Amino acid sequence: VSHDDALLNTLAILQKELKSKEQEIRRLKEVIALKNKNTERLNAALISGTIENNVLQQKLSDLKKEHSQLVARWLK
Amino acid sequence: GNIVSHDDALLNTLAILQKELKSKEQEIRRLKEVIALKNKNTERLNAALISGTIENNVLQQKLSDLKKEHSQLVARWLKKTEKETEAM
Protein backbone atom coordinates (compact mmCIF):
# COMPACT_ATOMS: atom_id res chain seq x y z
CA VAL A 1 0.00 0.00 0.00
CA SER A 2 2.86 2.45 0.81
CA HIS A 3 6.61 3.27 0.69
CA ASP A 4 9.43 1.67 2.75
CA ASP A 5 7.03 -0.68 4.50
CA ALA A 6 8.22 -3.94 2.97
CA LEU A 7 11.77 -2.71 3.57
CA LEU A 8 10.97 -2.13 7.23
CA ASN A 9 9.09 -5.35 7.81
CA THR A 10 11.85 -7.45 6.24
CA LEU A 11 14.54 -5.63 8.22
CA ALA A 12 12.43 -6.31 11.30
CA ILE A 13 12.17 -10.07 10.79
CA LEU A 14 15.79 -10.45 9.69
CA GLN A 15 16.85 -8.46 12.71
CA LYS A 16 14.93 -10.74 15.09
CA GLU A 17 16.47 -13.72 13.33
CA LEU A 18 19.97 -12.39 13.86
CA LYS A 19 19.39 -12.06 17.61
CA SER A 20 17.86 -15.49 17.74
CA LYS A 21 20.96 -16.98 16.07
CA GLU A 22 23.46 -15.13 18.23
CA GLN A 23 21.71 -16.59 21.23
CA GLU A 24 21.89 -20.02 19.61
CA ILE A 25 25.62 -19.74 19.17
CA ARG A 26 26.02 -18.98 22.88
CA ARG A 27 24.01 -22.03 23.93
CA LEU A 28 25.84 -24.30 21.51
CA LYS A 29 29.14 -23.05 22.90
CA GLU A 30 27.85 -23.73 26.40
CA VAL A 31 26.72 -27.23 25.36
CA ILE A 32 30.20 -27.97 24.04
CA ALA A 33 31.60 -26.74 27.35
CA LEU A 34 29.50 -29.20 29.29
CA LYS A 35 29.97 -32.14 26.96
CA ASN A 36 33.73 -31.70 27.33
CA LYS A 37 33.40 -31.85 31.08
CA ASN A 38 31.21 -34.90 30.82
CA THR A 39 33.76 -36.48 28.46
CA GLU A 40 36.61 -36.01 30.90
CA ARG A 41 34.52 -37.54 33.63
CA LEU A 42 33.65 -40.55 31.42
CA ASN A 43 37.26 -40.94 30.35
CA ALA A 44 38.30 -41.07 34.01
CA ALA A 45 35.62 -43.64 34.82
CA LEU A 46 36.46 -45.87 31.85
CA ILE A 47 40.20 -45.83 32.57
CA SER A 48 39.51 -46.52 36.25
CA GLY A 49 37.02 -49.26 35.48
CA THR A 50 39.30 -50.87 32.94
CA ILE A 51 42.45 -50.85 35.11
CA GLU A 52 40.31 -52.21 37.86
CA ASN A 53 38.74 -55.13 36.00
CA ASN A 54 42.25 -56.10 34.94
CA VAL A 55 43.40 -56.08 38.56
CA LEU A 56 40.42 -58.20 39.54
CA GLN A 57 41.19 -60.80 36.88
CA GLN A 58 44.76 -60.87 38.14
CA LYS A 59 43.56 -61.50 41.70
CA LEU A 60 41.30 -64.37 40.60
CA SER A 61 44.16 -65.97 38.72
CA ASP A 62 46.22 -65.66 41.92
CA LEU A 63 43.59 -67.06 44.21
CA LYS A 64 43.16 -69.87 41.71
CA LYS A 65 46.79 -71.01 42.04
CA GLU A 66 46.80 -70.63 45.80
CA HIS A 67 43.59 -72.59 46.11
CA SER A 68 44.85 -75.43 43.95
CA GLN A 69 48.11 -75.54 45.93
CA LEU A 70 46.17 -75.81 49.15
CA VAL A 71 44.17 -78.67 47.64
CA ALA A 72 47.44 -80.33 46.67
CA ARG A 73 48.34 -80.57 50.37
CA TRP A 74 45.90 -83.40 50.85
CA LEU A 75 48.34 -85.39 48.74
CA LYS A 76 50.90 -85.66 51.55
CA GLY B 1 18.15 13.44 -0.55
CA ASN B 2 16.32 13.21 2.79
CA ILE B 3 14.27 10.07 2.07
CA VAL B 4 16.85 8.74 -0.41
CA SER B 5 19.59 9.19 2.21
CA HIS B 6 17.39 7.27 4.63
CA ASP B 7 16.45 4.45 2.27
CA ASP B 8 20.11 4.01 1.26
CA ALA B 9 20.87 3.51 4.94
CA LEU B 10 18.08 0.95 5.23
CA LEU B 11 19.28 -0.87 2.11
CA ASN B 12 22.79 -0.94 3.51
CA THR B 13 21.60 -2.26 6.85
CA LEU B 14 19.68 -4.97 5.00
CA ALA B 15 22.82 -5.76 2.97
CA ILE B 16 24.80 -6.12 6.19
CA LEU B 17 22.13 -8.27 7.87
CA GLN B 18 21.97 -10.73 5.02
CA LYS B 19 25.75 -11.20 5.23
CA GLU B 20 25.81 -11.56 9.00
CA LEU B 21 22.93 -14.02 8.94
CA LYS B 22 24.48 -16.41 6.43
CA SER B 23 27.66 -16.04 8.48
CA LYS B 24 26.05 -16.98 11.80
CA GLU B 25 24.08 -19.91 10.37
CA GLN B 26 27.29 -21.25 8.85
CA GLU B 27 28.82 -21.07 12.30
CA ILE B 28 25.74 -22.64 13.83
CA ARG B 29 26.04 -25.58 11.43
CA ARG B 30 29.71 -25.87 12.35
CA LEU B 31 29.06 -25.77 16.06
CA LYS B 32 26.29 -28.35 15.74
CA GLU B 33 28.60 -30.76 13.92
CA VAL B 34 31.22 -30.52 16.66
CA ILE B 35 28.51 -31.30 19.20
CA ALA B 36 27.36 -34.18 17.01
CA LEU B 37 30.77 -35.89 17.00
CA LYS B 38 31.24 -35.26 20.71
CA ASN B 39 27.87 -37.02 21.16
CA LYS B 40 28.70 -39.94 18.97
CA ASN B 41 31.88 -40.34 21.11
CA THR B 42 30.07 -39.92 24.40
CA GLU B 43 27.95 -42.77 23.18
CA ARG B 44 30.87 -45.10 22.49
CA LEU B 45 32.11 -44.26 25.99
CA ASN B 46 28.72 -44.80 27.61
CA ALA B 47 28.78 -48.22 25.93
CA ALA B 48 32.22 -49.39 26.97
CA LEU B 49 31.71 -47.96 30.47
CA ILE B 50 28.38 -49.69 31.09
CA SER B 51 29.62 -53.00 29.68
CA GLY B 52 32.78 -52.78 31.76
CA THR B 53 30.87 -51.89 34.90
CA ILE B 54 28.75 -55.00 34.45
CA GLU B 55 31.84 -57.13 33.90
CA ASN B 56 33.34 -55.52 36.98
CA ASN B 57 30.41 -56.62 39.10
CA VAL B 58 30.64 -60.12 37.59
CA LEU B 59 34.32 -60.32 38.55
CA GLN B 60 33.72 -58.92 42.03
CA GLN B 61 31.23 -61.67 42.74
CA LYS B 62 33.51 -64.36 41.28
CA LEU B 63 36.47 -63.22 43.40
CA SER B 64 34.18 -63.07 46.40
CA ASP B 65 32.58 -66.48 45.84
CA LEU B 66 36.04 -67.99 45.27
CA LYS B 67 37.49 -66.40 48.40
CA LYS B 68 34.76 -67.91 50.61
CA GLU B 69 35.40 -71.31 49.10
CA HIS B 70 39.15 -70.92 49.56
CA SER B 71 38.43 -70.17 53.20
CA GLN B 72 36.32 -73.20 53.96
CA LEU B 73 39.28 -75.15 52.54
CA VAL B 74 41.91 -73.41 54.69
CA ALA B 75 39.54 -74.01 57.59
CA ARG B 76 38.97 -77.66 56.70
CA TRP B 77 42.71 -78.09 56.27
CA LEU B 78 43.17 -76.90 59.83
CA LYS B 79 40.39 -79.11 61.18
CA LYS B 80 42.28 -81.92 59.41
CA THR B 81 45.70 -80.75 60.65
CA GLU B 82 44.43 -80.37 64.23
CA LYS B 83 43.04 -83.93 64.32
CA GLU B 84 46.20 -85.44 62.83
CA THR B 85 48.36 -83.61 65.39
CA GLU B 86 46.02 -84.49 68.29
CA ALA B 87 45.42 -88.15 67.36
CA MET B 88 49.16 -88.61 66.71
Question: Whose CA is closest to B25, among A52, A9, A14?
Answer: A14
Of the residues A27, A56, A75, the best mutation for testing chain B's interface (the one with the most B CB atoms within 10 Å of its CB) is A56
Q: Is B39 left (phi over 0), alpha (psi -120 to 50) or beta?
A: alpha
Q: With H, G, I as helix, E, B as strand and everything else as coil, classify residue B74.
A: helix
The rounded distance, in Å, linking the Cα atoms of B66 and A43 is 31
DSSP type of residue A3: S
DSSP state string for B30-68? HHHHHHHHHHHHHHHHHHHHHHHHHHHHHHHHHHHHHHH
Chain B residues within 8 A of A4 when measuring between CB atoms: 6-7, 10
The rounded distance, in Å, linking the Cα atoms of B42 and A70 is 46
Alpha helices for chain A (secondary structure H): 5-71
Chain A residues within 8 A of B22 when measuring between CB atoms: none
**Domains identified in chain A and CATH numbers:** 1-76 (1.20.5.170)
CA B49 to chain centre: 7
Of the residues A5, A68, A70, the best mutation for testing chain B's interface (the one with the most B CB atoms within 10 Å of its CB) is A70
Question: Whose CA is closest to A20, among A30, A12, A8, A31?
Answer: A12
Decide: A28 and B32 in contact? Cβ < 8 Å.
yes
Residue A68: CA atoms inside 13 Å, Cβ hemisphere, count? 5
CA dist list (Å): B26 to A13, A25, A39, B29: 19, 11, 26, 5
The rounded distance, in Å, linking the Cα atoms of A18 and A9 is 14
- The contacts of residue A24 (CB under 8 Å, 6+ apart) are B24, B28
CA dist list (Å): B15 to A14, A67, B10: 11, 82, 9
The rounded distance, in Å, linking the Cα atoms of B25 and B41 is 24
Q: With H, G, I as helix, E, B as strand and everything else as coil, classify residue B13.
A: helix
Decide: A60 and B62 in contact? Cβ < 8 Å.
yes
The rounded distance, in Å, linking the Cα atoms of A28 and B8 is 35
